[PDB]
Design an enzyme around this catalytic site. Structure first.
Site, PDB file in Angstrom:
ATOM      1  N   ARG A  77     -12.061  12.255   5.945  1.00 52.96           N
ATOM      2  CA  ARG A  77     -12.938  11.834   4.860  1.00 52.96           C
ATOM      3  C   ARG A  77     -13.734  10.595   5.231  1.00 52.96           C
ATOM      4  O   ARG A  77     -13.280   9.791   6.052  1.00 52.96           O
ATOM      5  CB  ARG A  77     -12.109  11.529   3.616  1.00 52.96           C
ATOM      6  CG  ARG A  77     -11.244  12.675   3.160  1.00 52.96           C
ATOM      7  CD  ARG A  77     -10.207  12.186   2.191  1.00 52.96           C
ATOM      8  NE  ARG A  77      -9.160  11.439   2.873  1.00 52.96           N
ATOM      9  CZ  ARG A  77      -8.194  10.774   2.251  1.00 52.96           C
ATOM     10  NH1 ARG A  77      -8.144  10.756   0.926  1.00 52.96           N
ATOM     11  NH2 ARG A  77      -7.270  10.131   2.951  1.00 52.96           N
ATOM     12  N   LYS A 128      -1.040   7.213   7.731  1.00 52.87           N
ATOM     13  CA  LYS A 128      -1.389   8.635   7.664  1.00 52.87           C
ATOM     14  C   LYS A 128      -2.550   9.112   8.552  1.00 52.87           C
ATOM     15  O   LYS A 128      -2.433  10.107   9.262  1.00 52.87           O
ATOM     16  CB  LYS A 128      -1.684   9.012   6.213  1.00 52.87           C
ATOM     17  CG  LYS A 128      -2.169  10.441   6.014  1.00 52.87           C
ATOM     18  CD  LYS A 128      -2.662  10.647   4.581  1.00 52.87           C
ATOM     19  CE  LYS A 128      -1.609  10.252   3.552  1.00 52.87           C
ATOM     20  NZ  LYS A 128      -2.204   9.699   2.301  1.00 52.87           N
ATOM     21  N   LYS A 159     -12.027  -6.093   3.107  1.00 52.95           N
ATOM     22  CA  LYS A 159     -12.274  -5.835   4.526  1.00 52.95           C
ATOM     23  C   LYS A 159     -12.128  -4.351   4.850  1.00 52.95           C
ATOM     24  O   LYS A 159     -11.194  -3.691   4.387  1.00 52.95           O
ATOM     25  CB  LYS A 159     -11.314  -6.644   5.410  1.00 52.95           C
ATOM     26  CG  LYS A 159     -11.658  -8.115   5.547  1.00 52.95           C
ATOM     27  CD  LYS A 159     -10.669  -8.797   6.468  1.00 52.95           C
ATOM     28  CE  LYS A 159     -11.062 -10.230   6.764  1.00 52.95           C
ATOM     29  NZ  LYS A 159     -10.058 -10.874   7.665  1.00 52.95           N
ATOM     30  N   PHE A 187      -3.405   9.914  -0.717  1.00 51.49           N
ATOM     31  CA  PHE A 187      -2.127   9.641  -1.369  1.00 51.49           C
ATOM     32  C   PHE A 187      -1.017  10.458  -0.729  1.00 51.49           C
ATOM     33  O   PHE A 187      -1.233  11.102   0.294  1.00 51.49           O
ATOM     34  CB  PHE A 187      -2.185   9.928  -2.875  1.00 51.49           C
ATOM     35  CG  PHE A 187      -3.132   9.044  -3.632  1.00 51.49           C
ATOM     36  CD1 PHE A 187      -3.474   7.778  -3.152  1.00 51.49           C
ATOM     37  CD2 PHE A 187      -3.667   9.469  -4.857  1.00 51.49           C
ATOM     38  CE1 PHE A 187      -4.344   6.946  -3.872  1.00 51.49           C
ATOM     39  CE2 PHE A 187      -4.539   8.652  -5.595  1.00 51.49           C
ATOM     40  CZ  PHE A 187      -4.878   7.386  -5.099  1.00 51.49           C
ATOM     41  N   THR A 245      -3.793   7.472  11.056  1.00 52.20           N
ATOM     42  CA  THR A 245      -3.465   7.117  12.426  1.00 52.20           C
ATOM     43  C   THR A 245      -2.761   8.307  13.065  1.00 52.20           C
ATOM     44  O   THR A 245      -3.072   8.691  14.181  1.00 52.20           O
ATOM     45  CB  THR A 245      -2.548   5.879  12.481  1.00 52.20           C
ATOM     46  OG1 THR A 245      -3.255   4.742  11.972  1.00 52.20           O
ATOM     47  CG2 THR A 245      -2.111   5.589  13.910  1.00 52.20           C
ATOM     48  N   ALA A 249      -8.281  10.685  -5.019  1.00 51.89           N
ATOM     49  CA  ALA A 249      -7.212  11.669  -4.951  1.00 51.89           C
ATOM     50  C   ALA A 249      -6.383  11.722  -6.243  1.00 51.89           C
ATOM     51  O   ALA A 249      -5.315  12.344  -6.282  1.00 51.89           O
ATOM     52  CB  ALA A 249      -6.308  11.374  -3.752  1.00 51.89           C
ATOM     53  N   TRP A 263      -0.295   4.979  17.528  1.00 48.88           N
ATOM     54  CA  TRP A 263      -1.006   3.740  17.247  1.00 48.88           C
ATOM     55  C   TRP A 263      -1.179   2.911  18.519  1.00 48.88           C
ATOM     56  O   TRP A 263      -2.286   2.487  18.854  1.00 48.88           O
ATOM     57  CB  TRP A 263      -0.239   2.916  16.208  1.00 48.88           C
ATOM     58  CG  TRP A 263      -0.900   1.605  15.893  1.00 48.88           C
ATOM     59  CD1 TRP A 263      -2.057   1.419  15.192  1.00 48.88           C
ATOM     60  CD2 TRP A 263      -0.484   0.306  16.336  1.00 48.88           C
ATOM     61  NE1 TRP A 263      -2.393   0.088  15.178  1.00 48.88           N
ATOM     62  CE2 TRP A 263      -1.447  -0.617  15.872  1.00 48.88           C
ATOM     63  CE3 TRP A 263       0.604  -0.165  17.083  1.00 48.88           C
ATOM     64  CZ2 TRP A 263      -1.351  -1.995  16.129  1.00 48.88           C
ATOM     65  CZ3 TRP A 263       0.699  -1.535  17.338  1.00 48.88           C
ATOM     66  CH2 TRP A 263      -0.278  -2.432  16.862  1.00 48.88           C
ATOM     67  N   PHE A 320       7.711   1.724  14.441  1.00 51.17           N
ATOM     68  CA  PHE A 320       7.427   0.330  14.106  1.00 51.17           C
ATOM     69  C   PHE A 320       8.366  -0.554  14.942  1.00 51.17           C
ATOM     70  O   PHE A 320       9.545  -0.223  15.133  1.00 51.17           O
ATOM     71  CB  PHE A 320       7.649   0.073  12.612  1.00 51.17           C
ATOM     72  CG  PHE A 320       6.981  -1.177  12.116  1.00 51.17           C
ATOM     73  CD1 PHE A 320       5.595  -1.234  11.999  1.00 51.17           C
ATOM     74  CD2 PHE A 320       7.730  -2.313  11.808  1.00 51.17           C
ATOM     75  CE1 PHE A 320       4.956  -2.406  11.586  1.00 51.17           C
ATOM     76  CE2 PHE A 320       7.104  -3.497  11.392  1.00 51.17           C
ATOM     77  CZ  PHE A 320       5.714  -3.545  11.282  1.00 51.17           C
TER      78      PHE A 320
END
Lengths: 549, 548, 548
Positions: free
Chosen positions: A91, A68, A102, A298, A70, A270, A404, A378
């Site tokens: 945010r 999202k 991580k 979300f 990205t 959220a 991406w 992808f």
């Protein structure tokens, strides 16, 4: 080509602020690549028109991910390459996750807002302000009991918990004030992750400092031995809290890998909140720019809905368009396919999972804003699959994104499709529900129209709370559903577009610094814990650089 | 009002320049506050250091010390004499601001600025400590929750938690409640953030890699076999280090007279050494001819730990040392009531002087030259001052009005420090050795400094010390955690109590540093809000603050 | 007043004789209370048992049941007809006495005595349970303290503690605080003593060696691997047994009509079966032609568990079963307000009758003959009674005034029980089988008895049941822990609710017995004192008690 290994060429934020129209005396630096901007920039530019507001959301999140933020950064970059004056409002991540599982990037690949490390860490100290503002009030609550409890509060009824920005199970349930009459009044409480603090939500929804101060005074911390509400205002602590938020009230200016200006300010949950960045950043951005991209936590059934029904309602924003991100994989998971075989072509599963995306389209449509689908490309996806998903999107514009692995360039198609709908399909924005409806009528409107549920059930506890709140004068507030994000229902196993189901609220909480929080399942993970293998155990800072962040 | 003293500051970047710092070695926090890279030092590693002026004071009293003010007021005066000097002070805790009000970062026209920022978030140094401390704690509790691989006994865990607010309610608590899913039930608590051993380590570290390793040595508790389990065994030194990446750098600000002012660190003075960080002072050293720094409490505690801990590790060798004191101050040590400090009384002033004089001698015991300072107060009569003047018959002495005259009221004293720093060459040495016994160290500090005929150790203390020395932490320094209002452990014994004794009731270990031996209940590691808190009064106008 | 009914008792030793008990098989507790050795049974092991009269009742209501009274009043009447009969009742908790007052051990002239003793220490049966329960608890906590050899997870420990007083404050607590020397911190609580699984075991044990072994099976918690750790694994069954050495023996007392009255045991009715002990009733059986015993709550809970648990284990085969009910009672089930039970209303009386009738059928379902009983009340009009009389069109029916006439007001009903016990031969059978599935057992009890169209199991219940049956406790009986004021789980659904469902939210295991599946919050295992407690009013004169 890992995202962190992508530390490269940033332009001084002052430069960016100047080329945006911000005067030097409205810029407070924090290094050369970060700055907080005065609320004066909006105060003087308020009579000017607003740019276009583009909300990016996504399908029901699945373990396969969708990407999202990205897309948000890439879309913005794409609008920049296409010559549009634009900014992104995102945010600020919580510090905690950086040590448990991580820390990630503010986006991904070539679509991110930097400086990365700082944003995942202390950034500019906003969360610390929330932490102390929030904890100061708790301490004033406990000191006031210790001092004779003039307000006559029943300690056992105190709802203001404590806060901290790390993942620590141990502080979930605890007992305070032990040791004797000199050490306070014994009571049960606990800690919540800081970004869950109602204070963090007040920041994200305030006009400015004074508004922030007033919203603070309205915060209920507990009840008297008579059931009467007791607020921070009653403890005269809003001024002090406001003082701690003095700087945190200013949005922070940073940028994208491609130097597109960006605001990162605030960052709440959220489920227990609206999952949006502050209003003061977005409205400032709407003046400094012709196009503003922002996002919501979300999927669209929660973030988008609350962005519309809470953030925009308060701020007066009127979304011009909305982009919904989906992947072939996540979609195939809504179609039945296991996480393990998501690479294998399955047009039937893709066609059935689409049902999920199809529901979000329709939903977005119920707010008057045109929707555009962003397919996060992808590697394993097949042409047959993408093509199927493209035509299935028979209702709104669909464009594939390669942001991406190509930065703005991979999002030109999506940018042009957005611009295209921004010119021929102007929006007719309208919240989903009037505030004068009953708390249950709002809950039902949302559950019915957005989730596709048949109806709602309530436990005895939930019913008592709704009546206490309504007769106590908080029945006209907005409603923020705290449910599982992995399904349109409250059963996280029901993926796709579940039908003939009911939603059950078992508890109803109150955020007098905003609205009502009715939660379904254990959406009360207000304090995530650490994994057996804490990313922190591997973290180490070299004699120069960091590693394992 | 001291706050009203909001008038004309200068872009620290400039000062950073008019000092020799490469622009690429400065990170701003506005135009009036900024950090300095640890690169400045490493490159100027060989450059000649400057002089050291450890300002200190008598035994505190409810009358008014003058420690901090006189430290900046002197720097003004010194640099006002065409000298290259800075000020290395300590950052105050955030808590006092909402309880008893925030004060000046000096006094009168000798206060470092910007004031407000300094008493609030500043550059977020404390927050950083707060999180490196709490993450360690979270790692400790999450470890138990996983299976207690290190076989830790929750009940022995000494590593508390931290917050920078005055909250009594958090002194004693029970955590881990809830079930097999919410951790392991145990008894802990919170200490004010500036009491953190993390703050200590910060204020006593060379460079990140140093501060890191120190973290890895900190003890969080023991196994059921009495075996120590450190932060290092938890692999938390790395993460703890990263949270400190920025805080490690010292903060460059200034005086009201635009004199470079360094404010970095702020540990406790009893459970710790009460000194600003080292990396800071060792920096100002390179970037200046003279460096004016201070230490918490009276010289019997601060100066002593400053010499024995800071100067010990850092390698410093203080060339001078100023000890402050007012007329009213010593008088109280002469039995003069607080509501009776208005009237004259040379007889008391003389008696209380023993306080002042006693310190004078201890100072001289560190082969470091010494000099008296007098905070000129409106009531102090000529007679009083006149007496006190000659009373200091043993070392330099000068009056100071750095309060209501700024660097001006400091010229006098300023010349004297140079005069003596030029003619009085020290041979600085530690008051004790690192191989002596913990008790013998405590003793040497107790006798020669405190003036105790001897020391007593309770059953608890004994068991602890034996454990420690049997564990390996016996060759470490000693930080006397005791009352500060008296050379002795009895806070009522003002002046220079004689024929007394000192009794160490407890003994705490600080792997990231030394050994803490507390006397009385100096365990107030978490002060509390009053019934009439300043928080209830603080407000912020549609423009500015009013009440803080 | 019922207490005033302190008039003429008889040396139990005599009764013990006029029953056939060897003097060497009696231990006195005064001249009016005594225990009986378990030797009486073992020797008369082959002697022919007598008949069994399980008295029970409708669905309780805030109007007045009449369960207990009618049980003694019937025994009086029965023996008043030249019959060899006793009464096997339950000993009441001590707590209610100081909170809401202590009541009669029956009612009117049908109350067993001595009253006072019975509501207080009695013969110390409860205290014995209290200590066998708490010693196990102490052994559990001391085990952890030693090294947790069994690798127990304190957080999973289900074995609470116990006290026989109404104390809310003890419902949720934190124990083990203090340090490595004071145990391990964990969350526990207290339950009223009569809720103890120890009380259960007592009321469901053959002989010490039995009661012992049962103790050894009780589960106190699990290891970190989910492996159950029983009392047996702690080697506490022996000690627990010894504390019970006396309590195992039943207590012989009497009615106001000197009829032998046995009072032994007193478990909970929801979380347990609400029946007096077995060793007792199986004794009175030998020593008498007829044995009149009762069970807690309405027949939907007590009788059912009495048949399925007590009679199951003991081997009993109830030959009769009386179910009590008043006019006002059923009326409330007809919607008649409590403040409206004074006026007549045959229409409601008829509607509410469904309650009474529904039970009548369930009774008959145990191949055990049945008979109605009516507690004659001053307001009940001829009309009302007349209606109710014929309404019971299905089995025997008789009115009873055992309240204000003693064994006299019981003659009527007395003859009917014999009449039918002589002509109506039962073929007693358990309502379900011990090999069925826990759910199928719950179901059969839910359908045929409660009248639920089905049952629901929450996520919690499911996980538990699967654990249990996967652990080995699947072939055990089922004790429905639910509200008693309704055939269903909804305490508002009075009468004979239809088209409803039952939802088991939780599921607790009782190794020393069976399985407890709770519905609503029937977890009130520790009631609390009111704002106007009787303790504040109870007093004891330089002679006698006044207010208890």
């Amino acid at each position: 080509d890992i995202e962190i290994a992508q530390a490269a060429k940033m332009k001084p934020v002052m430069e960016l602020a100047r080329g945006l129209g911000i005067q030097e005396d409205e810029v407070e630096l924090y290094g050369k690549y970060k700055a907080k901007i005065s609320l004066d920039v909006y105060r003087r530019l308020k009579d000017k028109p607003d740019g276009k507001l583009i909300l990016v959301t996504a399908i029901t999140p699945t373990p396969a991910g969708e990407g999202k933020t990205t897309t948000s950064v890439g879309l913005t970059d794409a609008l920049a390459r296409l010559g549009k004056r634009v900014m992104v409002c995102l945010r600020e991540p919580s510090l905690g996750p950086s040590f448990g599982i991580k820390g990630g990037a503010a986006g991904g690949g070539y679509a991110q807002v930097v400086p990365m490390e700082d944003i995942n860490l202390h950034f500019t100290g906003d969360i610390h302000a929330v932490t102390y503002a929030h904890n100061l009030l708790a301490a004033m609550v406990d000191n006031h009991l210790q001092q004779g409890n003039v307000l006559n509060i029943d300690p056992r009824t105190i709802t203001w918990r404590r806060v901290i920005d790390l993942n620590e199970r141990a502080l979930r349930n605890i007992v305070i004030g032990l040791g004797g009459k000199a050490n306070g009044v014994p009571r049960e409480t606990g800690f919540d992750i800081s970004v869950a603090s109602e204070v963090m939500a007040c920041l994200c929804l305030a006009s400015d400092l004074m508004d922030l101060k007033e919203r603070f005074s309205r915060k209920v911390v507990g009840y008297t031995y008579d059931g009467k509400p007791v607020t921070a205002g009653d403890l005269e602590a809003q001024g002090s809290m406001a003082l701690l938020m003095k700087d945190a009230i200013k949005p922070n200016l940073v940028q994208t890998l491609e130097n597109t200006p960006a605001f990162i300010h605030g960052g709440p949950f959220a489920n227990i909140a609206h999952g949006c960045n502050s209003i003061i950043a977005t409205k400032t951005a709407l003046k400094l720019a012709d196009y503003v991209v922002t996002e919501a936590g979300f999927g669209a059934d929660l973030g988008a809905e609350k962005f519309y029904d809470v953030k925009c309602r308060y701020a007066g924003f009127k979304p011009d368009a909305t982009v919904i991100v989906a992947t072939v994989r996540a979609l195939k998971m809504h179609g039945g396919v296991p996480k393990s075989d998501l690479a294998t072509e399955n047009l039937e599963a893709l066609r059935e999972g689409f049902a999920n995306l199809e529901k979000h389209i329709e939903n977005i449509g119920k707010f008057g804003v045109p929707a555009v689908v962003a397919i996060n490309a992808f590697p394993t996806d097949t042409e047959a699959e993408l093509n199927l998903l493209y035509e299935l999107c028979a209702k709104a514009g669909a464009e594939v994104a390669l942001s991406w692995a190509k930065g703005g360039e991979g999002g030109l198609e999506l940018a042009r499709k957005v611009l295209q709908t921004l010119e021929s399909r102007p929006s007719n924005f309208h919240v989903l529900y009037n505030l004068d409806l009953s708390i249950k009528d709002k809950i039902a409107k949302i559950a019915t129209e957005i989730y596709g549920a048949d109806g709602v059930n309530y436990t005895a506890e939930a019913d008592k709370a709704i009546q206490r709140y309504e007769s106590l004068g908080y029945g006209n507030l907005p409603v923020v559903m705290a449910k599982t994000q992995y399904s349109f229902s409250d059963d996280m196993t029901k993926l796709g577009r579940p039908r003939n189901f009911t939603i059950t609220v078992r508890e109803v909480r109150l955020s007098a610094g905003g609205r009502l929080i009715v939660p379904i399942t254990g959406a009360i993970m207000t304090m995530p814990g650490l994994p057996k293998r804490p990313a922190a155990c591997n973290i180490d800072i070299d004699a120069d650089g960091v590693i394992t962040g």
